[PDB]
């Protein structure tokens, strides 16, 4: 009781200090300015809701003795939130439940008491037509149930809480969704709950009847609103279709839903990456690396970014497949350095011409590549090792025996050492001829490449590109 | 020592002599502008990147 009564009594009110200022300012705003007048294309309540997801990601950790959040639920759920003269008593009810935690004891919600914390939208003239309240009054309890996820006989409490929000989601899909942004501000509440709808299901449940419900969700999308409904319903469509073998990739080629034209700078950034791996996994190399690069330089400024630990790995998988390689550790971190050393040792073998050096990696770190889920692209680098090597040898040696190149590439056979060189010319790596009767492979010396048209093609790509950024500097300037 | 330029042969001693002032003015006096302009964009960080 002294170790309790000095360390337990400040966890109730100082969260009550900041929760009368963040979602009470959201409840004070997004009931009267999302159901109210307007929250326009330049709104604040979405970014305010962006402020009330991230803060509560790392806010709550403990099982909430002293009712420091276990008493917030009997406070924040007895809410009509209809109009100002009936919420002037509710502005007292933000303080009337504070002494319920203090003078008395509330109901400590420890893994059992969430069932009398969900049935309240009948109590004291509550509604569901005001879904700028009730979609947020879903998400204000729907987040902290599932934020820790706590995975011990809880899943049904998360489910029935989603079912009441799914009842709000059907009223979203059918009933009066126009110019109140009832779809728009709840497409985020659709999108943000889907990740809590998935990590439940990616933990212990199925995946696929939600997909047909998501097709029914994609049905009404772009069918009433063409803003942030075309965007988040397609990355959340793709998120396990890539990991499944279902058709889902040539569908997304001819699909019209490729461009929502705006997706709020962070869901748009990874959007070019989930379809960036689709061209990577189905052999479309050169088209992929520009939507892989564009999916990199549109991401914000966080540090614990473990998906960015994957895109920097994957972006130069396909560039090893094309030949080009940048320095990958050019932004090396204390958390990037350990995530590069097996994969950086791979591209060490690619810039060399050795053949079973590839085999000395693929037995040492063959298990690591299957953890990242990338092995099926790794296995085909032996075509690109041998074309790197045959370009390397033919440029160095001019008149080399074909019964010498195989011993240097440890090919163990001169009789197909002619044959890779045949496919080197069929692909077009080296030009010159082979004296198959003698055995030497002669190469012609290069000639005046300066007086060829091809450096103008190095220019014309970049003349037209540099006039574009001068035009974009004009088009983005005179907003005043 | 580059006081004269040419080539020497080892088999029979043939001195293939050639000359051209190739070009120097056009490229490297335009190349150093690029690294001057790189430092200008670096100095844009001290009035834009810090500021807005």
């Amino acid at each position: 009781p002294p170790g309790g009564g000095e360390q337990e009594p400040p966890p109730p009110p100082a969260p009550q200090d900041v929760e009368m200022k963040e979602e009470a300012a959201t409840g004070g705003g997004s009931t009267g300015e999302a159901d109210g007048k307007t929250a326009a294309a330049a709104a604040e309540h979405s970014q305010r809701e962006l402020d009330t997801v991230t803060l509560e990601d790392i806010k709550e950790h403990v099982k909430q003795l002293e009712k420091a959040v276990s008493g917030k639920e009997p406070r924040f759920v007895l809410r009509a939130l209809r109009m100002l003269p009936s919420t002037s008593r509710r502005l007292n009810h933000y303080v009337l439940y504070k002494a319920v935690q203090g003078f008395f004891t509330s109901n400590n919600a420890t893994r059992d008491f969430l069932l009398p914390f969900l049935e309240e939208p009948m109590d004291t003239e509550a509604d569901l037509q005001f879904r700028p309240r009730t979609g947020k009054a879903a998400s204000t309890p729907l987040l902290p149930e599932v934020e820790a996820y706590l995975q011990l006989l809880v899943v049904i409490f998360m489910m029935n809480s989603k079912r009441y929000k799914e009842a709000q989601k059907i009223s979203d899909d059918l009933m009066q969704k126009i110019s109140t942004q009832n779809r728009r501000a709840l497409d985020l509440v659709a999108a943000k709950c889907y990740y809590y709808h998935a990590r439940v299901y990616e933990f212990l449940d199925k995946l696929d009847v939600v997909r047909s419900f998501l097709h029914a969700r994609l049905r009404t999308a772009t069918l009433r609103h063409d803003a942030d409904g075309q965007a988040t319903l397609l990355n959340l469509l793709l998120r396990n279709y890539l990991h499944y073998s279902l058709y889902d990739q040539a569908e997304k080629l001819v699909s019209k839903s490729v461009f929502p034209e705006q997706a709020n700078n962070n869901e748009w950034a990874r959007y070019l990456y989930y379809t960036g791996r689709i061209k990577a996994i189905q052999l479309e190399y050169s088209e992929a690396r520009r939507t892989m690069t564009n999916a990199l330089r549109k991401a914000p400024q966080h540090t614990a970014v473990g998906f960015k630990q994957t895109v920097h790995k994957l972006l130069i998988v396909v560039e090893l497949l094309l030949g080009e390689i940048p320095d990958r550790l050019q932004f090396r971190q204390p958390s990037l350095k350990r995530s590069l050393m097996p994969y950086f040792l791979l591209t060490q073998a690619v810039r060399t011409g050795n053949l079973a050096k590839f085999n000395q990696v693929l037995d040492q770190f063959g298990e690591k590549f299957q953890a990242d889920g990338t092995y099926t692209l790794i296995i085909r680098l032996r075509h690109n090792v041998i074309k790197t090597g045959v370009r390397m040898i033919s440029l160095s040696y001019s008149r080399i025996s074909l019964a010498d190149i195989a011993q240097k590439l440890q090919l163990d056979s001169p009789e197909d050492a002619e044959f890779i060189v045949a496919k080197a010319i069929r692909d077009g790596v080296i030009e010159a001829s082979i004296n198959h009767e003698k055995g030497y492979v002669q190469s012609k010396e290069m000639i005046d490449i300066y007086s060829t048209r091809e450096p103008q093609l190095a220019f014309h790509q970049r003349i037209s590109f540099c006039l574009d950024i001068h035009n974009m500097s004009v088009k983005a300037m005179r907003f005043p | 020592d580059k006081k004269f330029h040419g080539i020497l042969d080892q088999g029979e001693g043939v001195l293939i002599i050639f000359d051209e002032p190739p070009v120097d003015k056009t490229y490297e006096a335009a190349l150093e502008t690029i690294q001057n302009m790189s430092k200008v964009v670096d100095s844009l960080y001290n009035k834009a990147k810090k500021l807005t």
Binding site: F459, R462, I463, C466, L467, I469, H470, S473, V474, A476, M477, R478, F479, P480 | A30, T33, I34, M37, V40, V41, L44, K47, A48, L51, T52
Partner: peptide
């Protein structure tokens, strides 16, 4: 190619010359 490269940098320095006159007056004037 050099002269067009200069054209992009100059208008970019002009771009900050409008971002100095956009943000530094909305708090001042309103």
């Amino acid at each position: 190619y050099l002269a067009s490269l200069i054209r992009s940098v100059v208008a970019l320095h002009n771009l900050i010359n409008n971002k100095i006159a956009n943000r530094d007056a909305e708090k001042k004037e309103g």
